[PDB]
């Protein structure tokens, strides 16, 4: 698709068999989703946003569908205001910015 | 141009007679610039994201040149860790997300 930006670029994702809404975010290095259960071990990570830094749980090699495109990669879990698809997975689905 | 997302999508902007670097951020509703002087009246605003909220000054009808494309709109000024071009100006330069 070609997504314009007059509205937030929200898409449906699928993770762990469940559908969720997430924001396609070119300003995010990483993918961050709200509290949920994921398999396997996690590693610690600190991330910075507009208001300061938070701790999150880093899960690697997670299967995630993004607007119907398959990705497998790192997902961070923590107290984000909205589910964010960042550049680590935007590159896997072939996304570019165009103007 | 077509900008891939292997790296942060940073571009040069001109605002207030000043050249700055800024992040093209589809996850941001608003454009937020580090502390600088701008003309006209302003009013205070709180904006949030990962890590919580910051207080900014809202200036309206500000002209920005973004990677050679001119746009006008509201610009928020405050202690953002990075200069952000958000959707309110991305739309004006015809930026889309494509995959």
């Amino acid at each position: 698709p070609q997504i314009t930006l007059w509205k937030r670029p929200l898409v449906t994702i699928k993770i762990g068999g469940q559908l969720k809404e997430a924001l396609l975010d070119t300003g995010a290095d990483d993918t961050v989703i709200e509290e949920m259960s994921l398999p396997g071990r996690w590693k610690p990570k600190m991330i910075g946003g507009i208001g300061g830094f938070i701790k999150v749980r880093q899960y690697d090699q997670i299967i995630i569908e993004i607007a119907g495109h398959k990705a497998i990669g790192t997902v961070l879990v923590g107290p984000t205001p909205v589910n964010i698809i960042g550049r680590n997975l935007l590159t896997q689905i072939g996304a570019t910015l165009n103007f | 141009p077509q900008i891939t997302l292997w790296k942060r999508p940073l571009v040069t902007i001109k605002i207030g007679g000043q050249l700055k670097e800024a992040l093209l951020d589809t996850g941001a509703d608003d454009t937020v610039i580090e502390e600088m002087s701008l003309p006209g009246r302003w009013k205070p605003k709180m904006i949030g994201g990962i890590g919580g909220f910051i207080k900014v000054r809202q200036y309206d009808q500000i002209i920005i040149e973004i990677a050679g494309h001119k746009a006008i709109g509201t610009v928020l000024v405050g202690p953002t860790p990075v200069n952000i071009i958000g959707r309110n100006l991305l739309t004006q330069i015809g930026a889309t997300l494509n995959f």
């Binding site: 300003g27 910075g48 | 992040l23 996850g27 937020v32 990962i50």
Partner: peptide, 7 residues
Amino acid sequence: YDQIXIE
């Protein structure tokens, strides 16, 4: 540290 800006 890694940077995540939504807003």
